[PDB]
Protein backbone atom coordinates (compact mmCIF):
# COMPACT_ATOMS: atom_id res chain seq x y z
CA UNK A 1 0.00 0.00 0.00
CA UNK A 2 2.93 2.27 0.70
CA UNK A 3 6.08 2.63 -1.32
CA UNK A 4 8.87 1.30 0.89
CA UNK A 5 7.11 -1.97 1.64
CA UNK A 6 6.75 -2.61 -2.10
CA UNK A 7 10.38 -1.69 -2.66
CA UNK A 8 11.40 -4.17 0.02
CA UNK A 9 9.25 -6.82 -1.67
CA UNK A 10 10.80 -6.45 -5.12
CA UNK A 11 14.30 -6.22 -3.69
CA UNK A 12 13.53 -9.49 -1.95
CA UNK A 13 12.34 -10.97 -5.25
CA UNK A 14 15.19 -9.97 -7.57
CA UNK A 15 17.96 -11.49 -5.49
CA UNK A 16 16.49 -14.98 -5.24
CA UNK A 17 18.69 -16.81 -7.72
CA UNK A 18 20.87 -14.01 -8.97
CA UNK A 19 24.51 -15.00 -9.15
CA UNK A 20 27.41 -12.58 -8.91
CA UNK A 21 29.95 -14.07 -11.27
CA UNK A 22 27.83 -15.07 -14.25
CA UNK A 23 28.44 -12.96 -17.33
CA UNK A 24 24.94 -11.66 -17.80
CA UNK A 25 23.64 -12.31 -21.28
CA UNK A 26 21.12 -14.89 -22.38
CA UNK A 27 22.81 -16.51 -25.38
CA UNK A 28 26.53 -17.16 -25.17
CA UNK A 29 27.58 -15.48 -28.41
CA UNK A 30 26.12 -12.12 -27.35
CA UNK A 31 28.21 -9.32 -25.93
CA UNK A 32 27.58 -6.53 -23.43
CA UNK A 33 28.44 -2.94 -24.23
CA UNK A 34 30.07 -1.24 -21.27
CA UNK A 35 29.76 2.42 -22.10
CA UNK A 36 32.52 4.53 -20.66
CA UNK A 37 33.57 8.07 -19.94
CA UNK A 38 35.46 10.23 -17.51
CA UNK A 39 35.09 13.65 -15.96
CA UNK A 40 38.04 15.34 -14.31
CA UNK A 41 37.56 16.66 -10.83
CA UNK A 42 40.95 18.33 -10.39
CA UNK A 43 44.53 17.79 -11.48
CA UNK A 44 46.56 17.54 -8.30
CA UNK A 45 50.22 16.99 -9.10
Amino acid sequence: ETRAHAEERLLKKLFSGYNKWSRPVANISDVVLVRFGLSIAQLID
Binding site: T2, R3, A4, E7, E8, L11, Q42, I44
Partner: protein, 132 residues
Amino acid sequence: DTEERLVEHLLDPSRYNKLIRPATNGSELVTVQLMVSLAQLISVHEREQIMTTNVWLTQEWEDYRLTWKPEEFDNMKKVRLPSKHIWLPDVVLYNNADGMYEVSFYSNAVVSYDGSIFWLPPAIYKSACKIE
Protein backbone atom coordinates in the same frame (compact mmCIF):
# COMPACT_ATOMS: atom_id res chain seq x y z
CA ASP B 1 15.42 -4.91 30.11
CA THR B 2 12.60 -2.95 28.47
CA GLU B 3 15.33 -1.08 26.61
CA GLU B 4 16.50 -4.49 25.38
CA ARG B 5 13.01 -5.46 24.23
CA LEU B 6 12.67 -2.17 22.39
CA VAL B 7 16.10 -2.48 20.71
CA GLU B 8 15.23 -6.02 19.67
CA HIS B 9 11.85 -4.84 18.37
CA LEU B 10 13.16 -1.89 16.36
CA LEU B 11 15.95 -3.60 14.45
CA ASP B 12 14.30 -6.83 13.36
CA PRO B 13 15.99 -7.64 10.03
CA SER B 14 12.83 -9.14 8.64
CA ARG B 15 11.07 -5.89 9.48
CA TYR B 16 13.76 -3.30 8.82
CA ASN B 17 15.85 -3.33 5.68
CA LYS B 18 18.34 -0.50 6.01
CA LEU B 19 19.00 -0.09 2.27
CA ILE B 20 15.72 1.69 1.52
CA ARG B 21 14.63 5.23 2.23
CA PRO B 22 11.59 6.24 4.31
CA ALA B 23 9.34 7.45 1.55
CA THR B 24 5.62 7.68 2.20
CA ASN B 25 2.59 9.21 0.44
CA GLY B 26 3.81 8.69 -3.11
CA SER B 27 7.51 9.68 -3.02
CA GLU B 28 7.85 12.65 -0.75
CA LEU B 29 11.27 13.98 0.04
CA VAL B 30 13.00 13.32 3.31
CA THR B 31 14.45 16.51 4.69
CA VAL B 32 17.88 16.37 6.22
CA GLN B 33 18.48 19.49 8.28
CA LEU B 34 22.20 19.84 8.78
CA MET B 35 24.26 22.48 10.47
CA VAL B 36 27.95 22.34 11.10
CA SER B 37 29.94 23.46 14.12
CA LEU B 38 33.65 24.15 14.23
CA ALA B 39 35.94 22.89 16.94
CA GLN B 40 39.36 24.22 15.96
CA LEU B 41 40.98 25.26 12.74
CA ILE B 42 44.07 23.07 12.85
CA SER B 43 46.21 24.28 10.00
CA VAL B 44 46.11 26.24 6.81
CA HIS B 45 48.85 24.82 4.61
CA GLU B 46 49.90 27.40 2.05
CA ARG B 47 52.30 25.29 0.02
CA GLU B 48 49.95 22.46 -0.96
CA GLN B 49 46.76 24.57 -0.37
CA ILE B 50 45.08 22.31 2.17
CA MET B 51 43.03 23.53 5.09
CA THR B 52 42.70 20.97 7.87
CA THR B 53 39.71 21.56 10.15
CA ASN B 54 38.06 19.57 12.94
CA VAL B 55 34.31 19.78 12.82
CA TRP B 56 31.04 18.39 14.24
CA LEU B 57 28.24 17.86 11.77
CA THR B 58 24.74 17.78 13.28
CA GLN B 59 22.24 16.09 11.00
CA GLU B 60 18.64 15.49 11.92
CA TRP B 61 15.84 14.00 9.91
CA GLU B 62 12.49 12.25 9.99
CA ASP B 63 11.88 8.50 9.92
CA TYR B 64 8.57 6.71 10.23
CA ARG B 65 9.13 3.02 10.95
CA LEU B 66 10.98 3.52 14.23
CA THR B 67 8.16 4.49 16.55
CA TRP B 68 6.40 2.90 19.46
CA LYS B 69 3.66 3.73 21.92
CA PRO B 70 5.47 4.86 25.09
CA GLU B 71 2.82 3.37 27.38
CA GLU B 72 3.64 -0.13 26.16
CA PHE B 73 7.30 0.05 27.16
CA ASP B 74 6.95 1.80 30.55
CA ASN B 75 7.57 5.46 29.56
CA MET B 76 10.65 5.61 27.42
CA LYS B 77 10.64 8.55 25.07
CA LYS B 78 14.15 8.39 23.76
CA VAL B 79 16.56 5.53 23.10
CA ARG B 80 20.01 5.08 21.58
CA LEU B 81 20.63 2.99 18.46
CA PRO B 82 24.12 1.82 17.36
CA SER B 83 24.85 4.19 14.43
CA LYS B 84 25.13 2.72 10.84
CA HIS B 85 22.61 -0.05 11.78
CA ILE B 86 19.78 2.37 10.91
CA TRP B 87 19.37 4.20 7.63
CA LEU B 88 21.48 7.30 7.18
CA PRO B 89 21.80 9.57 4.15
CA ASP B 90 25.37 9.85 3.05
CA VAL B 91 26.42 13.47 3.49
CA VAL B 92 30.10 13.95 2.71
CA LEU B 93 32.63 16.49 1.55
CA TYR B 94 33.05 17.11 -2.10
CA ASN B 95 36.15 19.22 -2.57
CA ASN B 96 38.49 16.77 -0.98
CA ALA B 97 42.13 16.14 -0.96
CA ASP B 98 43.37 12.61 -0.02
CA GLY B 99 40.12 10.69 -0.63
CA MET B 100 38.59 10.52 2.85
CA TYR B 101 34.97 11.24 2.01
CA GLU B 102 32.82 10.04 4.89
CA VAL B 103 32.94 10.93 8.61
CA SER B 104 35.42 9.55 11.11
CA PHE B 105 33.67 8.03 14.11
CA TYR B 106 30.07 6.72 13.47
CA SER B 107 28.64 7.36 16.93
CA ASN B 108 25.25 6.58 18.42
CA ALA B 109 21.99 8.10 17.26
CA VAL B 110 19.14 9.31 19.39
CA VAL B 111 15.70 8.10 18.42
CA SER B 112 12.57 9.78 19.78
CA TYR B 113 9.10 8.34 19.73
CA ASP B 114 8.20 10.57 16.78
CA GLY B 115 10.64 8.97 14.44
CA SER B 116 12.90 11.99 14.52
CA ILE B 117 16.55 11.03 14.39
CA PHE B 118 19.36 13.20 15.71
CA TRP B 119 22.98 12.50 14.81
CA LEU B 120 26.26 14.15 15.60
CA PRO B 121 29.51 12.55 14.54
CA PRO B 122 32.84 14.32 14.54
CA ALA B 123 35.33 14.48 11.69
CA ILE B 124 38.67 15.81 10.69
CA TYR B 125 38.40 17.16 7.19
CA LYS B 126 40.99 18.29 4.69
CA SER B 127 39.43 20.69 2.22
CA ALA B 128 41.41 22.07 -0.72
CA CYS B 129 40.96 25.81 -0.79
CA LYS B 130 42.26 28.45 -3.16
CA ILE B 131 44.88 30.77 -1.71
CA GLU B 132 44.92 34.47 -2.60
